[PDB]
């Protein structure tokens, strides 16, 4: 619609990384989702959920790690995708007991009851991941 400029809600950090402001309306959401479906290469992986934040992380497990595209979506969901092979590898499970924590600018954890996920962000934006996950947690679990 003329004058809608839905892109106002989108804040890019890099070519494969952005976050959304969360206060848009149900009608604006439709348009954000249409935009995503058309133009976001990760749409296929997120079950038609609007992506609220995405970007690359190195997920530590064992001695080393794997580079994954991490997607925080409506639901909420936290999906992670193998960006080379283009395959969904898993989700971080949501519940009221999920809690993010940033250790420093390049390391954050997501605590869940039976597993803590260890994520590295070499861009130095780990606090932005923590803050956004916590914003979503407040919206999901608080009035
Ligand atoms: O690739 P290799 O060296 O085999 O190591 C794998 C990857 O870290 C997996 O991540 P991804 O699924 O993103 O490929 C991880 O599963 P998670 O998805 O649970 O982190 C496996 O952990 P286990 O969870 O113990 O299987 C771990 O053994
Ligand atoms: Au936080």
Curated annotation (Swiss-Prot):
Induction statement: Stimulated by insulin, and the oxidants hydrogen peroxide and peroxovanadate.
Phenotype for residue 107 to E: Enhanced kinase activity towards PKB
PTM comment, free text: Autophosphorylation is inhibited by the apoptotic C-terminus cleavage product of PKN2. Angiotensin II stimulates the tyrosine phosphorylation of PDPK1 in vascular smooth muscle in a calcium- and SRC-dependent manner.
Record PTM Phosphoserine, positions in chain: 4, 95, 123
Resulting phenotype, residue 68 to A: No PDGF-dependent translocation to the membrane
Tissue: Appears to be expressed ubiquitously.
Residues with the Phosphothreonine modification: 107
Domain of life: Eukaryota
Domain annotation PH: ranges: 53-143
Subcellular localization: Cytoplasm; Nucleus; Cell membrane; Cell junction, Focal adhesion
Subunit comment: Homodimer in its autoinhibited state. Active as monomer. Interacts with NPRL2, PPARG, PAK1, PTK2B, GRB14, PKN1 (via C-terminus), STRAP and IKKB. Interacts with SGK3 in a phosphorylation-dependent manner. The tyrosine-phosphorylated form interacts with PTPN6. Binds INSR in response to insulin. Interacts (via PH domain) with SMAD3, SMAD4 and SMAD7.
Assigned protein family: Belongs to the protein kinase superfamily. AGC Ser/Thr protein kinase family. PDPK1 subfamily.
Comment block on domains: The PH domain plays a pivotal role in the localization and nuclear import of PDPK1 and is also essential for its homodimerization.
Described function: Serine/threonine kinase which acts as a master kinase, phosphorylating and activating a subgroup of the AGC family of protein kinases. Its targets include: protein kinase B (PKB/AKT1, PKB/AKT2, PKB/AKT3), p70 ribosomal protein S6 kinase (RPS6KB1), p90 ribosomal protein S6 kinase (RPS6KA1, RPS6KA2 and RPS6KA3), cyclic AMP-dependent protein kinase (PRKACA), protein kinase C (PRKCD and PRKCZ), serum and glucocorticoid-inducible kinase (SGK1, SGK2 and SGK3), p21-activated kinase-1 (PAK1), TSSK3, protein kinase PKN (PKN1 and PKN2).
Record's protein name: 3-phosphoinositide-dependent protein kinase 1
Source organism (scientific name): Homo sapiens (Human)
